[PDB]
Design a protein around this ligand. Structure first.
Ligand code: FE
Ligand code: FE
Ligand code: FE
Ligand code: FE
Lengths: 201, 201, 201, 201
C-alpha cells in the first residue's frame, strides 16, 4: 500500500500516568488505522476515476484524501512527539531553544500560546507548532479537524491532538488537565530533529 | 516586516489574451497585498497577546494568520507558476514529466483530474498539484478558501486560483474557459524547479 | 440572561442501558451549560461592540454566536427527542408516519439514510431530520460541528449528537452500536409535535 | 421538480445605478439556476441511494444538498429583499422598526454591525439579519459560503450576498462601495413581512 500504519516507538502504557494505555491502544490501533485505510482508498478511487474518465465524485474524493491523509500525517507526528517522562529533556535546548526564544520571547510564552490555542478549539482540532518556510519562523496554528486552518507548506514540529477521543476516557470534559499532563511527555529531542530538517527543505 | 508583497516576474499584460492585465493588476496590487498586510498584522497581534498575557482572541488570531498567510503563500506560488505563452514548454519534460506519468498515468490524465478539481469547487478555492513527503508522490488537492482541505507538510508545485476575482471580469461564470486558457501560460520550468527542491526535502 | 440551560425531562439514568447516566450528566451539566454561557457571552460582546462602535472582532463574535447558539439549539432538541424506552411508540404513526413514507419510501429507508449520515461524519457533527419550508418536505442533513452544512430556515425535528463526547465513554470508537442503541429511546411523540408545528410554520 | 427558480419581482435593470442589470442577469439566470438544479439533483441521488440501499456517497450528497439548497434559499430571499429605490421605505417602521431598536439600540447600530459583518468575511459568504426562535430576538449572522456558520431554525429576514460574483463586475475589489450602494435598494416592506410571519413559527 502507499500508506502504512507506523508502530508506536514505545509500549502502549509507557506514557502513563499522563496518558492512559487504554487511550493509546484505541487511538493507535483503531483510529489511526482508519485514516491509513481511508487515505489508501481515496487514492485507489482517484486512480479508478482517471482510468474511466469519470470525475463525478471528485469533490468527495479530494476531501476523503485531505481528511484521511491529514489524519495520518498528524498522528504519525503525534506519536513521535511523545516519550515516557525522564526519557527526554523537560525543556527545549540548543538551536530549538534559541529559536523558540526568538519567535515567542521565552519557552513559557510559547507554552501559554500553544495551550490557549489547544483549549480554545471550537470542535475537533489540533494545536500545532510549525515551521513556516515563507517567513522562516516558528508559528502556532490551530487545525480544525485534521485538514483545515493551515497554510500549504507548513512543516509540523510539535502537535497535540485535541479531538475528544484523545482525552475523554481519562480526563472527561476537563481538556485543561489533559494539556497540563501532556507537557510532561513531550519528546523535545524529536521536535529538535524535525526543526533541524525543516528549516532546510 | 516578516512578509512582503513579491513583484510580478512579468508585465501585468504579459499573460494576455489568456488572463487580462486588468485582472493581474487588481489581483496582485489589491488582493495579494491585503493578505500580506493581514498576515503581518496577525503576527503583531499574537505578539501583543503574549506581552499582555491575554489570549482571549486566540481563535480569531489563529484563523487570521492561517487565512492570510495561506493567501500569501498561494498567490506567491501562483505568480511564478505562470509565464508568457512561448517562454516555457507547453508540456512537462524530464524528471517532472516522468513523475506525472508515474502518479497519473499520463499528462492528459493529470490535466483531467486537476481541471475537474478546479471546476467543481463549492465556494472559493484552489486546484493544487502538491508533493506528498509522507507518501513520496504527487497528488492533486482541492483547497477551500486558502487554508482548508489540505494535509500539513503538503508542498505546492502548481496552483490555480479558483476564487471568482481571479476570472470573473473576463470569463464571468464560465469557469471552464478560464481553466482552459490558463493551461497555456503554465510555467513548467518553475514547476520542475519546485519538484526538484521538494523531492530532496 | 437571554439563554438558559433547560432541565432534562427525565432522570439522568432514565435512558440506560442505551445511554449511560454518566454521559447524560457530563453531557447536560458540563457540555450543554458551556454553550449557554458562550451564547450569552457572545451577545454581551456584540452589544459592547455596538456601544464602543468598534467591530474589530466581528468575525470572532459571529462565529462564537453561531457555534454556541447552534450547540444550545441542537442539545435542547436532542434532550426532548429522547425518552425512557416504553414511554413512547417505537415507530412513528399518524401524520408523521405518513410523511416519512412519503419522503423516504418507508421508516426503514429513513433509518438507513439517517444512520449512514450519522456514522459517516468526518469530524464532529450531527445527523438531523429537518422540515424544509421551501420544498415543504422532510430531509436528512449532516451537520458539521454544530453550525455548518445546513440551509437557513431548516426546522429540526429529530437530531442525533455524533460528537465523540456523546458516546465515547460507553461505546468507545464503535459509533455504529451507539446509533443502534439510540433508536430505542427516540421520543416519536416529541418529533410528531415538532412536525405539526413546523408544517403550519 | 421539487425546487424551482423564482422569477425576479422586477426588471433586471430596476436596481440601477446601485446594482447593474448585467450582474442581476448573470446572478439570477445563471448562478441561482445552478443551485436549483443542484438541489434537485441531490434529492434524486438520495432517492436512488435509498432504493439501492447504497449510501456510499452519503457525505457527498449531504453536502451537495446543503450547499445547493442553502444557495437557493439565500438567493430567493435576496431578490425579494430588494426593490428599486423610491418603491419602498428608506427605513424600517412600526413593529420591525421597534424590534430593531430593541435588539440593536438603533437602526444606525444595526447597519454598522451588519456592514461590519458583511465586509469582514474571509472567503465567500453572506451578512444576515435573522430571527432567532430560541431567544425570541433578531441577530446578525455571518454565513460562510451558503450553508455554514448558522444555527438550525434561523429564519432569514434580510440578507446580503457577499460572494464576489455579486459585486465584482461593477465594484471590483471595493466591497465597501457595494454595501453602501446596496442599502439604497433594501425593500423594508419585505423584511417587515418576513418578521411578522417569523416571530410566529
Ligand atoms: Fe486522534
Ligand atoms: Fe486570488
Ligand atoms: Fe453534545
Ligand atoms: Fe450569489
Amino acid at each position: 500500500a502507499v500508506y502504512t500504519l507506523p508502530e508506536l516507538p514505545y509500549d502502549y502504557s509507557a506514557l502513563e500516568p499522563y496518558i492512559s494505555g487504554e487511550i493509546m491502544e484505541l487511538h493507535h490501533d483503531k483510529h489511526h488505522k482508519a485514516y491509513v485505510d481511508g487515505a489508501n482508498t481515496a487514492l485507489d478511487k482517484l486512480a479508478e476515476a482517471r482510468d474511466k474518465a469519470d470525475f463525478g465524485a471528485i469533490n468527495k474524493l479530494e476531501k476523503d484524501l485531505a481528511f484521511n491523509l491529514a489524519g495520518h500525517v498528524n498522528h504519525s507526528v503525534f506519536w513521535k512527539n511523545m516519550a515516557p517522562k525522564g526519557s527526554a529533556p523537560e525543556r527545549p535546548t540548543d538551536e530549538l531553544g534559541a529559536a523558540i526564544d526568538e519567535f515567542f520571547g521565552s519557552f513559557d510564552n510559547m507554552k501559554a500560546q500553544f495551550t490557549a490555542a489547544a483549549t480554545g478549539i471550537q470542535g475537533s482540532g489540533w494545536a500545532s507548532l510549525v515551521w513556516d518556510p515563507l517567513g522562516k519562523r516558528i508559528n502556532t496554528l490551530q487545525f480544525y479537524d485534521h485538514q483545515n486552518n493551515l497554510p500549504a507548506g507548513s512543516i509540523p514540529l510539535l502537535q497535540l491532538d485535541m479531538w475528544e477521543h484523545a482525552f475523554y476516557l481519562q480526563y472527561k470534559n476537563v481538556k485543561g488537565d489533559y494539556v497540563k499532563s501532556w507537557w510532561n511527555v513531550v519528546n523535545w529531542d524529536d521536535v529538535a530533529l524535525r526543526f533541524s530538517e525543516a528549516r532546510v527543505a
